[PDB]
Amino acid sequence: ESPGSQSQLSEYCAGLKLYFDKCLGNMLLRLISVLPELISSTTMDLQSCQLLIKQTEDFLV
Amino acid sequence: NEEVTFFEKAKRYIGNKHLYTEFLKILNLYSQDILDLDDLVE
Amino acid sequence: QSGSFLCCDTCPKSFHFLCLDPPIDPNKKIESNFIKQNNNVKIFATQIDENSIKYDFFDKIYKSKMVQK
Amino acid sequence: KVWKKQRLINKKNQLYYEPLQKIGYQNNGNIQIIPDFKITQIDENSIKYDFFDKIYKSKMV
């Protein structure tokens, strides 16, 4: 299993589910890919961007 | 055998809230990998 | 154009996703969302609050003790 | 590294108060408890999370 926290991917499961129940897409792999590029527009910290991008590349590949 | 009940047992043992925050700070200080074995046992 | 941008998004009914605060008319939060789960509820456009994560912790400890042995 | 605290900044409440993911963050200590110069809050759930990570990575066998 994951050497870190095993709940996080389960959290990521919720991180997909309520993500897909809100907007239903405005256009099921493509909702993951659009996430890392709409990151620099926000005023969020660089560590949060780093954790977001490694979380989505865990599932992208 | 489990470790999830030790934390609430310690919370009941300490009692005071601010001492629990100090213990949490010390345990986090150990957790962030700079504290040796002697510091944590002492 | 020139004031006609509001009616442009009405006909397809779903064309934009950058900022949709109203439902159909596109043209404290951190501490509210923190109290339930981790940072995965961000970037969106008490004795009863602990057991819901206690069950997750029992499951995680059980799985880790299963794989470790 | 000796971890020479971080000192108490108070002018215009410059200590800052925002929850991060609180695990795998490496903020060189600098934590606060609520039931560079970046400090995030610490709750007990992240304490269980990163101790679970620590005793999982400490005992490889």
Account of the 3D structure:
The structure is cut from a larger assembly and holds one copy of chain A (61 residues), one copy of chain B (42 residues) and two copies of chain C. Chain A has three helices and no strands. Chain A has helices spanning 7-20, 30-34, 46-60. Chain A is globular. With 42 residues, chain B is mainly α. Helix content of chain B is 74%, strand content 0%. Chain B contains three helices and no strands. With 69 residues, chain C is mainly α. Chain C is elongated. The relative contact order of chain C is 0.08. Chain A binds chain C through residues 1, 5-8, 10-12, 14-15, 18, 22-26, 38, 42, 44, 48, 51-52, and chain C through 14-18, 20, 37-44, 56-57, 60, 63-64, 67. Chain B: Component of the RPD3C(L) complex composed of at least ASH1, CTI6, DEP1, PHO23, RPD3, RXT2, RXT3, SAP30, SDS3, SIN3, UME1 and UME6. Component of the RPD3C(S) complex composed of at least EAF3, RCO1, RPD3, SIN3, and UME1. Interacts with ESS1 and STB1. Chain B: It is found in: Nucleus. Chain B: This is Transcriptional regulatory protein SIN3. Chain C: This is Transcriptional regulatory protein RCO1.
Our measurement of the CA-to-CA distance between the termini of chain A, rounded to an integer number of angstroms, reads 16 Å
Helix content estimate of chain A? 55-70%
User: Shape of chain C, please?
Assistant: elongated
Total strand segments of chain A: 0
Helix percent band of chain C: 40-55%
Q: Mind telling me the C-alpha Rg of chain C?
A: 22 Å
Largest sheet of chain C at a glance?
none
The most extensive interface between chains reads:
A-C, 22 and 20 residues
| General shape of chain A | globular
Structural class of chain C: mainly alpha
Instruction: Name the beta content range of chain A.
Output: under 5%
Q: What is the CA-atom radius of gyration of chain A, in angstroms?
A: 12 Å
Structural class of chain A: mainly alpha
**SSE string of chain A:** HHH
Oligomer description: part of a larger assembly
Q: How would you characterize the largest beta sheet of chain A?
A: none
Distance between the termini of chain C: 67 Å
* Count of helical stretches of chain C: 3
Order of helices and strands of chain C: HHH
Number of helical segments of chain A? 3
PDB class: transcription
Keywords: Rpd3S, hdac, Hho1, cryptic transcription, transcription
Entry title: Rpd3S in complex with nucleosome with H3K36MLA modification and 167bp DNA
Chain A: Chromatin modification-related protein EAF3
